[PDB]
Amino acid sequence: HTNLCPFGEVFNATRFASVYAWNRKRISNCVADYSVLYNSASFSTFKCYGVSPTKLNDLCFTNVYADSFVIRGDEVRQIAPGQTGKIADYNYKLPDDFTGCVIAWNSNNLDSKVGGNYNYLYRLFRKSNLKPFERDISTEIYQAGSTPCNGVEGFNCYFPLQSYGFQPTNGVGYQPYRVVVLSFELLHAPATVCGKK
């Protein structure tokens, strides 16, 4: 086979999912041209764990997973193994043994509205921290007190998701950032994603 891996439509997609409902794309049976990535200067963050970006073109894998979402600037440092915070604990957690890359760039020119973009959400309350690569999209009313909530929002009964501000005038730490997390797995199966010859 000779088809290029669709890294274009993962990075260059119009709309990204909220970090609490992060989107995962499965990449298989294609030639992976990693050169476009580390050579494009569009990215503010490009950190690879478990493998070298240079040594990536000449390496095969069984599957490559492309997880994409949106957070704010000061939360970008939580998309890394061994981090804590609202995003790392309640939204998107990488394992301590993560073998992949994290790519992020400022999307304030796309994900901000003059009145505040209230489409991007993150999980604010959860009874326990997420396991690595876990996804929680429930909207159950969070019981913060002894009195049960019966699914009705109110005193000590929180809606678990919070909306990002995302105004063009926000400081950099609160501006939106689009994130792509490439994780490479090497299972005991035929390797379908390799690099060029």
Epitope: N3, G8, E9, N12, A13, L110
Partner: antibody, heavy 127, light 108 residues
Framework: QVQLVQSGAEVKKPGASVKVSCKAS????????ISWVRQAPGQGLEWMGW????????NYAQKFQGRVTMTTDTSTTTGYMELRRLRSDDTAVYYC????????????????????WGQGTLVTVSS | EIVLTQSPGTLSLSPGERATLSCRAS???????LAWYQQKPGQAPRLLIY???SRATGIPDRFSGSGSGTDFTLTISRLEPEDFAVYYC????????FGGGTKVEIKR
């Protein structure tokens, strides 16, 4: 150099069908989709549809649903657009372009547009 | 069905002048899914701007796009002889539609 060349002009009678070709080169055929645009004489551009060169998925404009069929032969890096039940209303120049508005692999909207258009194919429909 | 209406129909300017053309959308449209095209007489249209503001490969520095919500504009800093053509506004937020087109004519 990316280049798209289409079939030659064709004259058709009302009720007939026309299958216009579009051969691309200079880029990975699978990675992009093909979009088709129409332009009647002295009028603006009119979108016709979109096809994935990877899995063949197609969504057409509502105006042409039930008359137009788009196909793709990856062994020849060639795309095909067929318009059936031709009307004199359909006399126009039919264009073909490399699409970066919907991904060929997952079919989701992209940040881009139509680039590297073909020269165009003039289809004249009259008796 | 999002409708794009460009304004004005014809722009009468002389070379060297600045040209600002706009298209309005019947509904709000994300800036990522807006594109501008230029069509010289007798040629196929070419992509000028995608994502409302990002310049396509090979386009010279005089073209620039901006806008949000429903009001998007294409601007040309200094007009040139080769710049006088018809320009088309295009969106693919929902489905895909084109604008009516704006012609930039040489004023005299």
């Amino acid at each position: 150099q990316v280049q798209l060349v289409q079939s030659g002009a064709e004259v058709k009678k009302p009720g007939a069908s026309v299958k216009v070709s579009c051969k691309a080169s200079g880029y990975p055929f699978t990675s992009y989709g093909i979009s088709w645009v129409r332009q009647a004489p002295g009028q603006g551009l009119e979108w016709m549809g979109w096809i994935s060169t990877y899995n063949g998925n197609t969504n057409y404009a509502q105006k042409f649903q039930g008359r137009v069929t788009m196909t793709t032969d990856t062994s020849t890096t060639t795309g095909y657009m067929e318009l059936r039940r031709l009307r004199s209303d359909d006399t126009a120049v039919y264009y073909c372009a490399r699409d970066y508005t919907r991904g060929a692999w997952f079919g989701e909207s992209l940040i881009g547009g139509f680039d590297n258009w073909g020269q165009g194919t003039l289809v004249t429909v009259s008796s | 069905e999002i409708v794009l209406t460009q304004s004005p129909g014809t722009l009468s300017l002389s070379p060297g002048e600045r040209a600002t053309l706009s298209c309005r959308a019947s509904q709000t449209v994300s800036s990522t899914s807006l594109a501008w095209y230029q069509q010289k007489p007798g040629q196929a249209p070419r992509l000028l701007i995608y994502g409302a503001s990002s310049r396509a490969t090979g386009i010279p520095d005089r073209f620039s796009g901006s806008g949000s919500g429903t009001d998007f504009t294409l601007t040309i800093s200094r007009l040139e002889p080769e710049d006088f053509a018809v320009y088309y506004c295009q969106q693919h937020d929902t489905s895909l539609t084109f604008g009516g087109g704006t012609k930039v004519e040489i004023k005299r």
